Amino acid sequence: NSNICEVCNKWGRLFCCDTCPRSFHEHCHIPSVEANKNPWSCIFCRIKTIQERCPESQSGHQESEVLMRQMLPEEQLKCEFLLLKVYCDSKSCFFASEPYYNREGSQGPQKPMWLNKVKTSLNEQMYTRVEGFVQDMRLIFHNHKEFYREDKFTRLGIQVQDIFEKNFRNIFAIQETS
């Protein structure tokens, strides 16, 4: 196995995948690393199995159809993995915990949102369709853009949204366009 967490790139108390070389902190893996299960297979491994079981699942899809999918186990897993891909970027720190808003000339968002809130909402099965999860994720970045206005810090929202959107297109096999 690797000697650092795949998500945060730090050492520590690492749980090791049995089917690939990755390792994880317990609360860095999504879902949190399971109590028993020997062998244990990480989310990367579980996503690759889905693809291998149904190769046609990589054919292009329309985003509108993806969003309307119910959160059955395979879509639940895909959202977990997309969330994890965002935490993989170090810039996710800015969006992880509950924000607060007190800047001259701006007003906070009507509906604050943050990664750990989305993580809880997935864990508690609060989303019934893919659209629920994607809306809350895009809301994080939209709130940041609107609040920070012309401050150059707005760019952090653009950057981490780009990571989200590239991974969304990959994981859900969105049809490539010009």
- The contact set with Zn ion (CB under 5 A) reads 5, 7-8, 17, 20, 25, 28, 42, 44-45, 54
- Cα separation, 19 vs 21, whole angstroms: 7
Closer residue to Zn ion, CB minimum distance, 19 or 135: 19
Shortest Cβ 143–Zn ion spacing (Å)? 26
Nearest CA-CA partner of 134 in 144, 122, 145, 146? 122
Q: Which is nearer to Zn ion, 5 or 134 (CB)?
A: 5
Residue with smaller CB distance to Zn ion, 48 or 117: 48
Q: CA 61 to CA 175: how far, in whole Å?
A: 5
β-strand partners of 16: 23
Instruction: Pick the closer one to Zn ion by CB: 44 or 148.
Output: 44
CA-CA distance, 177 to 107, in Å (whole number)?
A: 37
Q: Calculate ∠ Cα 142-148-149, nearest 5°.
A: 90
CB of 42 to Zn ion, least distance (A): 3
- Considering beta carbons, is residue 23 or 143 the nearer one to Zn ion? 23
As measured in angstroms, the least distance from the Cβ of 59 to Zn ion is 11
